[PDB]
Design a protein around this nucleic acid. Structure first.
Lengths: 32, 167, 515, 120, 379, 460
RNA sequence: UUGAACAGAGAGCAUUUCCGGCAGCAGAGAUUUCAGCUGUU
C-alpha cells in the first residue's frame, strides 16, 4: 500500500532529506 | 560518621547539598585531597545541590543572619530541613548533616532529634569548597547577584549591631 | 548474544577440564569474547558515511569508458576542487606522497624541487630547491617532519623546511618508508642494504644486508610492519629488523620486480615485473592467486586502495580493477570481455596521460581520489569507491587541530612499539614459546620427568632399540655409529656398537634359518 | 554465602544492605505532630469534627615477548591463549564492552567503614 | 565517551526495528546520524535547553512515523516488542537529563510533567511524585508548582490527605503569598461541598458538624489575615499608622475577593460565611477603629451586608419582609453615619435595589414593584 | 551511469559553535586498528613502570610517638580514623589519624601494656554516650585490666569524664585482651584464659585448656561466639561460648604469635608464627592449612586481615611489613625504613586503604595498602584509565620483563643476605631429602601445608 | 525481646489476580483525544 501524505511528511522530517527544497529551488524562477 | 547532607547558609537563602562521595579522612591532610577542594572537576564528584530556599527580602535576610550568628534556628531553616532531611530514628542511625558552625548543632538537634550534626575538619573542607566555588554549584538557580547581596547584608548587619541612627 | 552478518571481520582466531575454577573461568572468557564480538559488530549502525560507487545502468555502458571531465561535472564541487592539477614543467618528474591523514601532500622532483603543502587548503608549508638529484620523500609521524632521499645521503627537514639531520649512515637510498607505530624510517637503495632508523631517539636500529644488488622496489605491510623488497633477480623478500636474513623469499617474477603493493588487511600483495607480468599473491598462506601475463608494456607501478581497488600504471596509462584481489578465477584482472562474458574482470577504470610517463601512484587516504605523479607534476583522478569512507578519529583524524596533533604525538610516542615486536604474525606477542611444553608441569610432574631422565641411562632408552626386521643398511644403530666421530670412543658408542652387533647376529641367524 | 561471594564476579561494598528510612516528601508531613499554627487549628477542627622459502631460525630477540611456559591457573596452552583472544582496549571493543571488561572485581566506597558481613 | 555509550544503548531498538518489517537499514542509519548529532550536542560543552527540546521533538516525530509504519505494513496497532516503548523511554530520559542539567527552566519542567502525565498507562504515580519532589525541593518558593501538585493529586487520585499536606507545606514555605491561601480555601470548600453532596446522594439512594459548616475555611481565613498582615508589614518596613492603614486596606481587598469566592460557592452557607467575615471586620484591627479609620470601607461593608441580606435570594422570588428589614437596617446605618455618608449609602442602596428589582420587574407587572419604586423615591 | 563519491559535510566533523567539542567518528574495523597485542602489551608495560614510579607508600607517622616501643595497637571497628596504642612504659594514647594527633594519653599501668582493645560497653543500669565518648580496655603485667573513656569531637550535637571508669583486678598477669563484637563480655589471656563481663568485677568463667599460659586472643568477627588463643606450648586452641568450653587444640612446631579471623569468612583465620611464616587455617579441618605465606626472614610478630578479606598484612622481627593476597603464598609488597625497627603490631585500616604499624623504636606509622594509589577522588576519565591499566597489567603479568619490573623492590641488605642464606640452607635440605628418597624405596611425600603440624587433640 | 493499633516510604521481594484484543454505549479533555462502563475474544 502507498504511504499516506502524513506519513511522507513525517518521513521527510525524520530522514532529513531536502528533495522538496531542491525541487523548489529548481522551480523558483521569475515568479514575481 | 560519613556525611550524608550538607547545609550552606547563603546571604540569599539556604542551600542543602547531598554528599555523593565521601572524601577519605585518614589521608585528609594529603596533597591530593587538599587540592581536590580547589579543583572543580573533582569537587563535583563529591557534592551535588538538592535544594535551595531563597529569602523573601532584605529584612528576612538580616533576621536570618542574626539568627545564624546567635546560633538559633529560624522558621526558614526548620522548613528547609523538614523538606529535605529524611525522617530517621533517634535511637539508632541518625542522619548526618554537615554544619559550618558548631554552636548551631544543639539547636538543630533539639528541633530534629534524628539529626547528628558534624562540624569536624572534613565537613569544614566540604563547606570551604562550597564557599570557594559558589555560583557554579547552584546550576543557575540563583536569582540575584550574590556579591551585591553579600555587600548589602554586611552593611545592614553592621548598622543593626551598632544601632546606626540617621537622626 | 544474537548472531550478526558482519561478525566475521570482528572474529579473532586462536592457536573438558576437571578443575571447576578453571572451567568457570574459561566459560566466562568465552562468554565475554562472544559478547564483545557481537557488540563490536553491532556498532556498524553508527557508521556516518558510505563508500562510493560507479555503476553502469545499460549494457552499452562501460565503466572504463568514463572520463574524468564527466566525473568532475557529475560529482559535487568540493570533490571536483579536490581533484587538483599542478603543472611543474622544469624539475620533473615528480614522486608524490600523502600524509596518513591525507591532509598534506609532499612532492619531490628529480631535479631537487621538494615541496610540502596542505593541498586541500592550498597552503604551502615548505619548498626546497636542493639543486640535486632527489628520488623519494616521506612524512614522519606528522606533517611536521619529512625525509628526503637526495643524491647520496638522506636528509630530515622540519615543517618550515630547515635541515635537522643529515643521515650519513643511509647511503644512496632510493626508497623511503615510515612505520607509524614503531617510529621507524626505513631506507633501501642502490647499496642493497635495508636500514631502520628510530626517528624519536636517533639511533639506527638495524642494518640488514639483502645480498641481492640494488633494491628495485619496496613496500611495507601495514598489517605487521614487515618490509617487502623487490630485487632484480625476481624475488620479493620479507624483512624484519630483528632478523639478519629475510623471513620469506618469494619467486615472483622472471626479470626485475618493478613494483610492490600490499593491501590494508595485509592479506594480499600485488607485484609487477619487467617481464610484463602482474601477480596477485596471498600473503598469509604464501600462495599466488593470479598471474596476469604479457601486459602490453611492463607495469611501472601498482597501488592498492583502502577499499581494495588495484591501480596499475604502465607508462602513460593508469588502469584500475575492482574486486581483483579475491580468490576466485573470475576475479582475475583482464582487459577485454570476449563477447561480454560476465566472468571476466574488465577494468574498473582507465585514464591516459598522453605524452607523459607516470612516476608513482598513491591513493589519497579517506578520499575517493588517486594521486598520480608524472613528468610535469601531479594530478588527482576522481575514483568513486577508492577511499575508506568511515575513518576512526582516534587513529587518524583528517580534521585534526593543532592541539590534537600535539597530544597525539606524545600519545604515540608513549605507545611506540619496540622493533623486536615486528614478526610475520602480529599475534605472537603473549604466546607460549614454541620449544616450551604444551601442558603445564608442576613440581610432581617435573620431579617425575627428572627421575625418568635419570633412569633412562639405566634403562638404555637413549640408544635406539635393536630392530631385527629393519635392515642394517637403514638401521638406526648403524647411522648412530656412523654419525659419531671415529676417533672418540665413549660408553654410549660402546653400548650402541654392542647392540648393533647383537642385532646383526640375530638378523644373520634369522636369515640362516630362512635359508 | 562464602562460596557465593567467592564465585561472584563483582563484589560492591557495602555488601550488607544498609537500613533505609522514609524519603522526605512534600506529599506527607514527616513529624506526625503539627508544627505550624495553621496545622494546629485545621487538625483541631478536623479532630472535633622453490617458489617460497621460509626462514626457520629462532628469532632470539623475540623470546622476551613470549611466555616461558604455560602459567599456573591454566593447565594448557590452548586455554592460556584463549585467555588473550579479545583486546580490552577502546580501539577494538564497544564502549559498554570496554567498561565491562575493565570493571574490577572488588569495589569499595572511598571513605566508609567496611563491616564484617551479616548472616542472612 | 558518553555519546558513544548512549548510541550503543540506542542499538537494540534498531535491532528490533530491522527485525520487524518497519524500517530499512539505511533508514536506521539516517535516524542514527540525526541521533549522533543530538547526543553530541547534549554531551558536549556549550549546550542549551533548546537542544534538549529539539531532540525530544525529533524523537516524538520518529515515534509518530514508527506508529504510521506499524499501522501500514504489519496492519497491527502496536507490536509486542521493544520498539513501542523505547522511544518513550528515551524521551523521558532526555527530559530527566535536561532537568538535571538546567533545573531552572520552568518551561522544561512543565514539559516534562505534561509528557509524563500524558503517557498515563505506561507511567507511574511514583514517577510523577518523584518529579514533583525534585521540583519542589529545587523551587520551594514557586507557588504555582505547589498548586499544580495539589491539583494533580486532587483530580487524578482524589487524595485529600495528600492535597492537605501539600497545601500546608506550601504555605509553610510561602506564607506571604495570598494566592496559596486562596487556593487552600478553595480546596477545603470543594472538599466539604463534595462531602455534603455525597451525603445527599446517600440520602436519596436509601429507601450539625463544623466540617459541614465551614469552620476549617474560617480558621484558614483568620490565620490568612494575621499572617498576610504580618508579612506585608515586614515587607514594607504617624507614618507607622499610615502604613498600618494601608495594610488594613490591602487585607480588605483580599477579604472582599474571598467574599466573591463565597458568592461563587452557591451550595455552601453563604450567609454563614458572610456573617463570619463581617464579624471579623466588625472586630477592630491594627490597633485602630475600623469605622473611624476607613469610613468609606465601613460604609461599603455596611452596604454589602444590607445588600447581601437579600442578594442571595432571587429578585423574582424576593421577600417583601426581607427587603423591608434590609431597608430598616440601611436606615439605621444612615442614622448612625454622617449626613454625606448617609446620602452616599442611600444612593448606593437605591442603585443596588434598582438593578436588583426595578429592571427585572415592572411596576405594572408587580403590585409590590410600585411599593418598591415608592421606597426608592423615598430613599 | 551512477556516480557517487565520498562527500563529507563539514558540519558533521567541524562544529559550528566555538564552544562545542569536535566529533569523534569511530570505526571498530580491525583493519583500521593493527597491532592489538603489541599495543596493549606496551600500554601494560608502561603501566607497570608508572606503578613503579608512583610507588610512594609512606603516608606519615602519628604524633611524636611513644617514649618506648609500641606493643599494643587496636583499631576502632566503628570509626574510620581512630586508633589506640600502648607502649612498654605503661602509656596509652588514643589517636585521630585524620589530624594525626592524639585525643588523650594516659599513664595507665606500671608494667608493659600487654593488651589493648576498643569497646562499646553495655551496662545494665545506664547507656554510655557512644557518640561523644569512646572506650578502651587495657591489660598489663601489674595484674590489672582497666577501662577508659575518651572525649571525642566527631559530632556537635551538644555544648564529662575522661579516665578510669572501672578497674578489673586479677590474681596473675594478663598477656592479651579482646572484646566481644555484640556482647559486653571480653576475654584476657595470661596464665589462664578468663571470660569477663563489664558489669562484674571478677571473671565470669575460666576457659583454660590445662595448665599452660595463653599469649594472645582473638574473637571471631562473624560468629561472634568463637574465640581463638595462642599458647606458649606451640598450641592454638579454639573456644566456643555457647558451649562455654575450649573446642579444639592444635600443636605446631613453633609458637604462634598472633591470630586474625577473616571478616568475610567466619571459619578462616591466619596465624603468625616463629617459623618465619604465616598459616591460613580452616576451623572445620585443622589437619591441614589452606595456605602458607613464606616471604619473611625472622619471626612474624603480627597479622591483620583487610576488611574485604582479600589480603593479609604481616609485620615481623626482620623489621619489615609484607602484604599478601590470600590466593598466593608469597608477598605482594614489602615496606621498610632505616628508622623502622622490630615491628610488633600491624593493623589494616577499616577503609582497607591504609596500614598502621607500631615498632620497637616507639613510632606508629601510616602506609598505603597499595603504594601507587592516591587518595583524591578521580574524574571519570582518570578512573577509567586507572582501571584499564590495572586490567592490562593483570592480563600481561605473565610476561618476562613485565614480571621483572613488577617484582622489583629495594630490600635491606640484612634481609637480602638472610634470604640467600635461607635459599642455600633450603637447597641443602633438598639434596639431603633427595639422598634419603634415593636410599629408601618408599618414603611418604608430606605436603608443605601439612609440615607445620605436630598434632591435633581431636582426630579426624 | 515480642505483640497490637496508628502513620507511612517508594525503597526491596513475590504473584499460578487483572489490564496493555475487538465491538458497543456514555462522559470528559484539547474535529480528535482521553480514561471509564457494558459485552465479546
Amino acid at each position: 500500500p502507498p504511504p499516506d501524505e502524513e506519513e511522507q511528511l513525517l518521513a521527510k522530517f525524520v530522514f532529513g532529506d531536502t528533495t522538496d527544497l531542491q525541487e523548489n529551488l529548481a522551480k523558483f524562477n521569475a515568479d514575481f | 560518621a560519613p556525611i550524608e547532607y550538607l547545609l550552606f547558609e547563603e546571604p540569599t537563602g539556604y542551600a542543602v547539598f547531598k554528599v555523593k562521595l565521601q572524601q577519605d579522612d585518614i589521608g585528609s591532610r594529603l596533597k591530593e585531597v587538599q587540592e581536590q577542594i580547589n579543583d572543580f572537576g573533582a569537587f563535583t564528584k563529591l557534592i551535588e545541590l538538592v535544594s535551595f530556599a531563597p529569602f523573601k527580602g532584605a529584612a528576612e535576610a538580616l533576621e536570618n543572619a542574626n539568627d545564624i550568628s546567635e546560633g538559633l534556628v529560624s522558621e526558614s531553616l526548620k522548613a528547609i530541613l523538614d523538606l529535605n532531611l529524611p525522617k530517621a530514628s533517634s535511637k539508632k542511625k541518625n542522619i548526618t548533616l554537615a554544619i559550618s558552625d558548631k554552636n548551631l548543632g544543639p539547636s538543630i538537634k533539639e528541633e530534629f532529634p534524628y539529626v547528628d550534626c558534624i562540624s569536624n575538619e572534613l565537613a569544614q573542607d566540604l563547606i570551604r569548597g562550597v564557599r570557594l566555588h559558589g555560583e557554579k554549584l547552584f546550576k543557575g538557580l540563583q536569582s540575584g547577584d550574590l556579591e551585591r547581596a553579600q555587600l548589602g547584608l554586611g552593611h545592614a548587619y553592621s548598622r543593626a549591631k551598632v544601632k546606626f541612627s540617621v537622626q | 548474544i544474537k548472531e550478526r552478518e558482519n561478525q566475521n571481520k570482528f572474529e579473532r582466531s586462536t592457536y573438558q577440564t576437571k578443575d571447576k575454577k578453571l572451567r568457570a573461568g574459561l566459560k566466562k572468557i568465552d562468554e565475554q569474547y562472544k559478547k564483545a564480538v557481537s557488540s563490536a559488530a553491532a556498532t556498524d549502525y553508527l557508521l556516518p558515511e558510505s563508500n562510493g560507487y560507479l555503476e553502469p545502468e545499460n549494457e552499452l555502458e562501460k565503466t572504463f569508458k568514463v572520463q574524468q571531465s564527466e566525473i568532475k561535472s557529475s560529482v559535487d564541487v568540493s570533490t571536483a576542487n579536490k581533484a587538483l592539477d599542478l603543472s611543474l614543467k622544469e624539475f620533473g618528474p615528480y614522486h608524490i606522497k600523502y600524509a596518513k591523514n591525507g591532509t598534506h601532500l609532499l612532492i619531490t622532483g628529480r631535479k631537487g624541487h621538494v615541496a610540502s603543502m596542505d593541498w586541500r587548503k592550498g597552503q604551502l608549508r615548505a619548498e626546497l630547491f636542493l639543486n640535486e638529484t632527489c628520488h623519494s620523500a616521506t612524512y614522519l609521524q606528522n606533517e611536521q617532519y619529512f625525509a628526503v632521499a637526495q643524491k647520496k645521503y638522506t636528509f630530515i627537514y622540519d615543517h618550515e623546511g630547515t635541515e635537522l639531520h643529515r643521515l650519513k649512515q643511509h647511503i644512496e637510498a632510493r626508497h623511503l618508508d615510515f612505520l607509524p607505530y614503531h617510529y621507524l624510517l626505513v631506507t633501501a637503495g642502490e647499496t642493497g642494504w635495508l636500514k631502520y632508523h628510530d626517528v624519536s631517539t636517533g639511533q639506527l636500529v638495524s642494518e640488514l644486508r639483502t645480498k641481492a644488488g640494488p633494491t628495485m622496489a619496496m613496500a611495507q605491510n601495514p598489517w605487521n610492519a614487515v618490509m617487502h623488497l623487490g630485487h632484480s633477480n625476481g624475488t620479493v623478500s620479507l624483512w624484519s629488523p630483528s632478523m639478519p636474513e629475510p623471513l620469506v623469499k618469494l619467486l615472483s617474477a622472471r626479470g626485475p620486480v618493478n613494483s610492490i603493493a600490499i593491501d590494508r588487511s595485509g592479506y594480499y600483495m600485488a607485484t609487477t615485473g619487467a617481464d610484463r607480468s602482474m601477480k596477485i599473491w596471498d600473503i598469509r598462506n604464501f600462495k599466488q592467486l593470479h598471474s596476469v601475463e604479457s601486459l602490453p608494456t611492463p607495469g611501472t607501478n601498482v597501488s592498492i586502495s583502502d577499499t581494495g581497488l588495484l591501480a596499475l600504471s604502465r607508462g602513460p596509462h593508469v588502469t584500475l580493477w575492482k574486486d581483483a584481489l579475491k580468490l576466485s578465477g573470475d576475479s582475475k584482472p583482464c582487459f577485454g570481455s570476449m563477447g561480454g562474458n560476465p566472468h571476466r574482470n574488465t577494468p574498473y577504470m582507465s585514464h591516459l596521460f598522453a605524452g607523459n610517463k607516470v612516476e608513482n601512484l598513491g591513493f589519497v587516504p579517506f578520499e575517493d581520489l588517486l594521486g598520480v605523479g608524472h613528468q610535469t607534476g601531479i594530478t588527482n583522478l576522481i575514483v568513486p569507491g577508492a577511499g575508506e569512507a568511515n575513518y576512526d578519529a582516534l587513529e587518524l583524524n583528517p580534521f585534526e587541530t593543532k592541539k590534537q596533533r600535539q597530544e597525539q604525538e606524545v600519545r604515540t610516542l608513549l605507545n611506540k612499539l619496540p622493533a623486536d615486536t615486528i614478526t610475520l604474525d602480529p599475534n605472537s606477542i603473549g604466546s607460549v614459546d614454541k620449544r616450551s611444553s604444551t601442558i603445564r608441569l608442576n613440581a610432581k610432574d617435573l620431579a617425575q620427568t627428572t627421575m625418568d631422565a635419570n633412569n633412562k641411562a639405566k634403562t638404555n632408552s637413549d640408544i635406539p632399540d635393536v630392530k631385527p626386521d629393519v635392515k642394517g643398511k637403514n638401521s638406526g644403530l648403524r647411522s648412530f655409529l656412523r654419525k659419531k666421530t671415529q676417533n672418540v670412543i665413549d660408553e654410549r658408542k660402546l653400548r650402541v656398537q654392542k647392540q648393533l652387533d647383537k642385532e646383526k647376529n640375530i638378523r644373520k641367524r634369522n636369515h640362516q634359518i630362512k635359508q | 554465602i562464602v562460596q557465593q561471594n567467592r564465585r561472584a564476579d563483582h563484589l560492591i561494598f557495602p555488601l550488607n544492605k544498609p537500613t533505609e528510612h522514609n524519603h522526605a516528601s512534600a506529599f506527607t508531613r514527616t513529624q506526625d505532630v503539627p508544627q505550624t499554627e495553621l496545622q494546629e487549628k485545621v487538625d483541631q477542627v478536623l479532630q472535633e469534627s622453490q617458489n617460497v622459502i621460509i626462514n626457520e631460525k629462532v628469532n632470539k630477540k623475540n623470546l622476551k615477548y613470549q611466555s616461558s611456559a604455560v602459567p599456573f591457573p591454566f593447565e594448557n596452552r590452548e586455554q592460556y591463549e584463549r585467555s588473550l583472544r579479545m583486546p580490552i582496549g577502546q580501539e577494538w571493543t564497544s564502549r559498554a564492552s570496554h567498561q565491562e571488561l575493565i570493571k574490577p572485581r572488588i569495589m569499595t566506597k572511598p571513605g566508609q567503614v567496611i563491616d564484617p558481613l551479616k548472616a542472612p | 565517551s558518553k555519546t558513544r555509550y548512549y548510541l550503543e544503548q540506542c542499538i537494540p531498538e534498531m535491532d528490533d526495528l530491522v527485525e520487524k518489517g518497519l524500517f530499512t537499514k539505511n533508514e536506521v542509519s539516517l535516524i542514527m546520524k540525526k541521533r549522533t548529532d543530538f547526543e553530541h550536542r547534549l554531551n558536549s560543552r556549550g549546550s542549551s535547553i533548546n537542544d534538549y527540546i529539539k531532540y525530544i521533538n525529533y524523537e516524538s516525530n520518529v515515534n509518530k512515523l514508527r506508529a504510521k509504519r506499524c499501522k501500514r505494513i504489519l496492519q497491527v496497532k502496536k507490536t509486542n516488542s521493544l520498539s513501542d516503548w523505547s522511544i518513550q523511554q528515551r524521551i523521558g530520559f532526555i527530559y530527566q537529563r535536561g532537568t538535571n542539567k538546567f533545573p531552572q527552566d520552568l518551561k522544561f519542567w512543565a514539559m516534562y510533567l505534561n509528557y509524563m502525565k500524558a503517557r498515563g498507562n505506561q507511567t507511574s504515580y511514583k514517577k510523577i511524585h518523584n518529579i514533583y519532589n525534585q521540583l519542589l525541593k529545587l523551587h520551594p518558593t514557586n507557588v504555582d508548582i505547589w498548586i499544580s501538585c495539589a491539583k494533580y493529586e486532587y483530580e487524578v487520585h482524589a487524595n485529600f490527605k495528600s492535597c492537605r499536606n501539600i497545601f500546608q507545606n506550601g504555605l509553610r514555605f510561602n506564607p506571604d503569598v495570598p494566592k496559596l491561601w486562596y487556593e487552600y480555601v478553595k480546596f477545603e470548600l470543594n472538599f466539604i461541598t463534595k462531602l455534603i453532596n455525597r451525603r445527599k446522594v446517600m440520602g436519596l439512594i436509601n429507601e450539625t458538624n463544623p466540617a459541614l459548616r465551614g469552620d476549617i475555611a474560617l480558621t484558614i481565613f483568620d490565620v490568612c489575615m494575621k499572617t498576610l498582615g504580618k508579612h506585608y508589614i515586614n515587607k514594607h518596613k504617624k507614618m507607622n499608622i499610615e502604613l498600618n492603614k494601608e495594610t488594613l486596606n490591602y487585607l480588605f481587598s483580599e477579604s472582599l475577593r474571598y467574599i466573591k469566592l463565597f458568592d461563587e460557592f452557591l451550595d455552601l452557607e453563604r450567609d454563614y460565611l458572610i456573617n463570619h467575615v463581617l464579624q471579623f471586620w466588625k472586630n477592630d484591627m491594627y490597633d485602630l477603629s475600623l469605622r473611624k479609620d476607613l469610613p468609606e470601607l465601613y460604609l461599603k461593608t455596611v452596604m454589602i451586608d444590607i445588600t447581601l441580606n437579600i442578594r442571595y435570594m432571587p429578585v423574582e422570588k424576593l421577600d417583601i419582609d426581607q427587603l423591608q428589614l434590609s431597608v430598616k437596617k440601611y436606615f439605621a446605618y444612615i442614622s448612625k453615619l454622617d449626613s454625606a455618608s448617609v446620602k452616599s449609602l442611600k444612593n448606593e442602596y437605591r442603585s443596588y435595589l434598582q438593578d436588583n428589582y426595578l429592571k427585572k420587574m415592572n411596576a405594572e407587572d408587580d403590585p409590590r414593584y410600585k411599593i418598591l419604586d415608592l421606597i426608592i423615591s423615598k430613599l | 551511469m551512477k556516480i557517487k563519491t565520498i562527500k563529507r559535510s563539514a558540519d558533521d566533523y567541524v562544529p559550528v559553535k566555538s564552544t562545542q567539542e569536535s566529533q569523534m567518528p569511530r570505526n571498530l574495523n580491525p583493519e583500521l586498528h593493527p597491532f592489538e597485542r603489541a599495543r596493549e602489551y606496551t600500554k601494560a608495560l608502561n603501566a607497570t613502570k608508572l606503578e613503579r614510579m608512583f610507588a610512594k607508600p609512606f603516608v606519615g607517622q602519628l604524633g611524636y610517638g611513644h617514649r618506648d616501643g609500641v606493643y599494643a595497637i587496636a583499631k576502632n571497628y566503628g570509626s574510620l580514623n581512630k586508633l589506640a596504642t600502648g607502649s612498654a612504659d605503661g602509656v596509652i594514647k588514643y589517636w585521630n589519624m585524620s589530624t594525626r594527633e592524639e585525643f588523650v594519653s594516659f599513664k595507665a599501668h606500671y608494667g608493659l601494656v600487654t593488651g589493648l582493645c576498643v569497646t562499646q560497653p553495655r551496662f545494665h543500669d545506664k547507656k554510655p554516650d557512644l557518640k561523644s565518648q569512646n572506650f578502651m580496655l587495657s591489660c598489663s603485667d601489674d595484674k590489672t585490666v582497666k577501662l577508659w573513656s575518651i572525649n571525642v569531637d566527631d559530632y556537635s550535637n551538644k555544648n564529662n569524664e575522661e579516665g578510669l571508669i572501672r578497674t578489673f583486678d586479677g590474681e596473675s598477669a594478663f598477656q592479651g585482651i579482646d572484646s566481644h563484637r555484640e556482647n559486653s563480655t571480653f576475654a584476657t589471656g595470661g596464665a589462664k584464659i578468663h571470660l569477663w563481663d563489664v558489669n562484674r568485677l571478677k571473671p565470669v568463667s575460666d576457659l583454660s585448656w590445662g595448665a599452660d599460659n595463653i599469649t594472645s586472643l582473638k574473637f571471631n568477627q562473624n560468629e561472634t561466639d568463637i574465640l581463638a588463643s595462642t599458647g606458649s606450648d606451640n598450641s592454638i586452641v579454639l573456644y566456643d561460648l555457647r558451649t562455654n568450653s575450649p573446642t579444639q587444640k592444635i600443636v605446631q612446631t613453633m609458637r604462634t604469635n598472633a591470630i586474625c579471623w577473616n571478616p568475610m569468612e567466619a571459619f578462616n583465620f591466619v596465624t603468625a608464627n616463629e617459623d618465619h611464616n604465616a598459616y591460613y587455617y580452616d576451623m572445620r579441618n585443622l589437619s591441614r592449612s589452606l595456605n602458607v605465606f613464606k616471604d619473611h626472614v625472622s619471626a612474624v610478630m603480627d597479622v591483620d586481615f583487610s576488611p574485604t578479606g582479600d589480603e593479609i598484612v604481616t609485620g615481623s622481627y626482620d623489621k619489615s611489613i609484607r602484604i599478601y593476597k590470600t590466593n598466593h603464598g608469597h608477598s605482594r609488597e614489602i615496606y621498610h625504613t632505616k628508622r623502622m625497627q622490630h615491628v610488633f603490631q600491624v593493623k589494616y585500616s577499616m577503609d582497607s586503604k591504609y596500614i598502621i604499624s607500631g615498632s620497637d623504636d616507639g613510632n606508629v606509622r601510616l602506609w598505603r595498602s597499595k603504594a601507587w594509589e592516591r587518595s583524591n577522588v578521580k574524574t571519570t576519565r582518570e578512573k577509567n584509565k586507572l582501571e584499564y591499566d590495572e586490567k592490562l597489567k593483570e592480563r600481561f603479568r605473565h610476561m618476562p620483563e613485565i614480571k621483572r619490573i613488577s617484582r622489583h623492590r629495594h630490600v635491606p641488605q640484612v634481609i637480602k643476605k638472610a634470604q640467600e642464606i635461607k635459599n642455600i640452607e633450603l637447597s641443602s635440605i633438598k639434596r639431603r631429602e633427595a639422598n634419603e628418597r634415593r636410599t629408601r624405596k618408599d618414603m611418604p611425600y608430606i605436603s608443605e601445608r601439612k609440615k607445620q603440624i605436630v598434632g591435633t587433640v581431636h582426630k579426624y
